[PDB]
Amino acid sequence: MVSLPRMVYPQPKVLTPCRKDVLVVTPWLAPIVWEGTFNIDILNEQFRLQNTTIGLTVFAIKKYVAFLKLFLETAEKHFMVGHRVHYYVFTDQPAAVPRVTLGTGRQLSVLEVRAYKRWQDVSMRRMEMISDFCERRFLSEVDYLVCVDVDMEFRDHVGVEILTPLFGTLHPGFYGSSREAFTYERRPQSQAYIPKDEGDFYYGGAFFGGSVQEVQRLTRACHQAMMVDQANGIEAVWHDESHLNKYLLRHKPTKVLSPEYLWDQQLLGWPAVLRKLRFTAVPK
Amino acid sequence: MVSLPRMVYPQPKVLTPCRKDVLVVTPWLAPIVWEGTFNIDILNEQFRLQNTTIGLTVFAIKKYVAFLKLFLETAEKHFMVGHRVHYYVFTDQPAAVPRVTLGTGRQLSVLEVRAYKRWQDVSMRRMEMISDFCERRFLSEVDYLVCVDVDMEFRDHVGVEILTPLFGTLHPGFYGSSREAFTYERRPQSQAYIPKDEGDFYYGGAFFGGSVQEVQRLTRACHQAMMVDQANGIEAVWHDESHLNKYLLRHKPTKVLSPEYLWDQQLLGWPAVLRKLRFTAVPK
Ligand SMILES: O=c1ccn([C@@H]2O[C@H](COP(=O)(O)OP(=O)(O)O)[C@@H](O)[C@H]2O)c(=O)[nH]1
Ligand SMILES: O=c1ccn([C@@H]2O[C@H](COP(=O)(O)OP(=O)(O)O)[C@@H](O)[C@H]2O)c(=O)[nH]1
Ligand SMILES: [Mn+2]
Ligand SMILES: [Mn+2]
């Protein structure tokens, strides 16, 4: 990496934590990203100097096309502003994608794919489709991939602080829960099985990412695991999210995002521990 | 990575920090390594699965050969035990290197180099010498390089928790100090110059490291800066440490080690904030 320029900002204080109310590093030394833990000016410098391109995948199959306008418009206000962004919209209805005005250095591609009848299958098949397009396109077109649900909107900054070889996001329903309470797949017959004495966190299927290489590996593995389960007459309790959790248990993420990055205010309010609500559920 | 095996350990608690008394992550999201922040079993698994080899460089020029016996014997007890280790002892007196019994998977190489007259030159020229041998040997022989002073002994675990592309260590004299008090080079004529309003930390010249590529970059850059200074007729106030600090200001380390890793118990005692004293000064 090339040198940063002179910058003036508050000195970090070794004997003064940024946050004392939350865990800010995992036991494998991956940062857990909360507001107050990062200086976004330093991080922007680091990633801009490397001319980073970020891909964002989103699936808008069947009626879910209705979520695209707000998803994309709010993404324009909050997601990686100042950096190169390439949106990839996976849909069975190219003509139904709204014409959203994009900022400079940002582009959008529509990837036409099949629709599945069951929402579970639409959700699950994202793994296969992302993996497939890593090979077809993403490896050549972007440096990182961020893979999210479409039934969401950005309300605050989501930026290069999340970028790392592999990240998961704390599910907003479980961040304060004991591992026994996590809704991992519990049947040993399933490839997603995690027993009650294992597990670090419950990650949300709605927001993960990393380098293209790591996301390719993750999505390929989750898809293969789902195909094995299918052959064994089993479907994991929480579908792709169950498999995501099994993957990230055994392949530790190099950053973990706090629930600021995946929230539902209707269901969970605005707890003191959340200084910002960045990416939130839209009522559906 | 390849998958980790099933492991049983206590669950990380999102709403319960491991350490509330110290900063455990930098504003650029690099872990600051303190006892309690890492699970060494997880980390050992990760690095052993990668067949990691760690190089350790140490200079024992002139009278400093006296320190080698204790340095090496204690390294055998505490440094990277269980992993492949390659010691590189730089000396003007190959015959004076004590014969120290090494554990399996550990090797020692004696590198014969010139002895400079001025201690300042001895200390400063380590940068050139490390950089030269990165090309000569380290690139093909080790994955990471750890570069330390010889007038030291290991007293507790120093392991794979430190490994990362680039690391510096908090100097024990300044970890609680404001940047204005840091003994950076303050003369603008010097390549190591840092203004009073810049600076994250004061890093110790006695303990830094990283991937071979990053250590080659750092040591080459510091040597070049020193040569420019020499041509301009100036020598930085704290020699190689001043240049190391300039380098790490502009090239942020991906981990920072706490003063557990670089201490002087005679001068500073054993404060409560240090749960372990791992690598400590030998009186001289
Ligand atoms: O008919 C569907 C069902 C699902 N999805 C995609 O699959 C994601 C996950 O589904 P959903 O959001 O309904 O799951 P939930 O958040 O309720 O767990 C959605 O965001 C969409 O991106 C879709 O496009 N069309
Ligand atoms: O005559 C010398 C002077 C320096 N050194 C090496 O340079 C390092 C830095 O010097 P020193 O330890 O004296 O610096 P200090 O810790 O006192 O700042 C030493 O640990 C030795 O490894 C050496 O080998 N011989
Ligand atoms: Mn959703
Ligand atoms: Mn020393």
UniProtKB/Swiss-Prot annotation, chains A, B:
Residue positions the entry lists as glycosylated: N51
Post-translational changes noted in the entry: The soluble form derives from the membrane form by proteolytic processing.
Consequence of substituting T101M: In allele Aw08
Function (record text): This protein is the basis of the ABO blood group system. The histo-blood group ABO involves three carbohydrate antigens: A, B, and H. A, B, and AB individuals express a glycosyltransferase activity that converts the H antigen to the A antigen (by addition of UDP-GalNAc) or to the B antigen (by addition of UDP-Gal), whereas O individuals lack such activity.
Localisation per UniProt entry: Golgi apparatus, Golgi stack membrane; Secreted
GO biological process: carbohydrate metabolic process; lipid glycosylation; protein glycosylation
Effect of G173S: In allele Bw08
Entry protein name: Histo-blood group ABO system transferase
UniProt-reported outcome of changing D229N: In allele B104
GO molecular function, one term: fucosylgalactoside 3-alpha-galactosyltransferase activity
Residue numbers on the Lumenal membrane side: 2-284
Effect of E241A: Almost complete loss of specific activity in group B transferase
Residues the record lists as binding UDP-N-acetyl-alpha-D-galactosamine: F59, A60, I61, Y64, D149, V150, D151
Topology term for the membrane: Single-pass type II membrane protein
Principal localisation: Golgi
